[PDB]
Amino acid sequence: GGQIEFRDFGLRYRPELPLAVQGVSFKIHAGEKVGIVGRTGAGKSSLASGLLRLQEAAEGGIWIDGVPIAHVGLHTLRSRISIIPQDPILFPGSLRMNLDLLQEHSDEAIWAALETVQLKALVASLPGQLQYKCDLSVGQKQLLCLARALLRKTQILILDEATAAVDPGTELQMQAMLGSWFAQCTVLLIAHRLRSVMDCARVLVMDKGQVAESGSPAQLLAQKGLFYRLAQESGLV
Ligand SMILES: Nc1ncnc2c1ncn2[C@@H]1O[C@H](COP(=O)(O)OP(=O)(O)O)[C@@H](O)[C@H]1O
């Protein structure tokens, strides 16, 4: 399904530190694409880090399809939950290994995923093709991550926006797929550019470790709240 629910959630990265994020309660419906916006330090990455249970729950809990992730095997928990970082690091070695470390797919199915993210041609161009070792641009590495997210049968796609200048063709293919191959996939897009979540149907606005406001960009723009302030600073409104 990919339906996530934070219920009064907070996490700390280390015992001695204060809660990085606290009292976060929200329900993401299965298959939804929700943008997550906020300033640096607001708590956007912590939500994904709480989902992946990188940091354990300090308060409340998270539930994925009615199952408390607190009671879900970590490998299981993380198997169909995929994250696309800003600057993905290829695991040193075979390209195929990066795409399929567990070797649970056939070269056939891997090439499909690549062609899905429109990297089949690039990969075919590569010196070792699938066996190509690691180069590829940050945008391409993200796409490769997207193809891997497909192979994983991912139902929760956490996407991290590149803080660096966005490749015009990567953005074109990335959006091209989010509504088609990840249509049924829940997509948490953690955005560092407010413009990127404007077409989103729903945005969580993170603020100093707490959910500040929720709803569509139009709703949040009308509220003239933190979301609205970020749009002004961004020059969108
Ligand atoms: N590795 C870390 N160790 C300790 N504190 C952290 C770490 N990463 C983030 N934080 C803190 O937790 C809070 C939440 O930030 P974060 O979740 O990273 O939001 P964002 O994704 O918007 O940067 C911030 O105050 C941040 O400084």
Swiss-Prot record:
It comes from the Eukaryota. The modification Phosphoserine is found at residue 25. Residues 4-233 form the ABC transporter domain. Residues 1-237 are cytoplasmic. ATP 2 binds at residues 38-45. Expressed in kidney and liver. Very low expression in other tissues. In testis, localized to peritubular myoid cells, Leydig cells, along the basal membrane of Sertoli cells and moderately in the adluminal compartment of the seminiferous tubules. Coiled coil: none annotated. It is found in: Basal cell membrane. Belongs to the ABC transporter superfamily. ABCC family. Conjugate transporter (TC 3.A.1.208) subfamily. It is linked to Pseudoxanthoma elasticum: A multisystem disorder characterized by accumulation of mineralized and fragmented elastic fibers in the skin, vascular walls, and Burch membrane in the eye. Arterial calcification of infancy, generalized, 2: A severe autosomal recessive disorder characterized by calcification of the internal elastic lamina of muscular arteries and stenosis due to myointimal proliferation. The disorder is often fatal within the first 6 months of life because of myocardial ischemia resulting in refractory heart failure. This is ATP-binding cassette sub-family C member 6. The gene is ABCC6. The chain holds residues 1262 to 1503 of 1503 of the full protein.
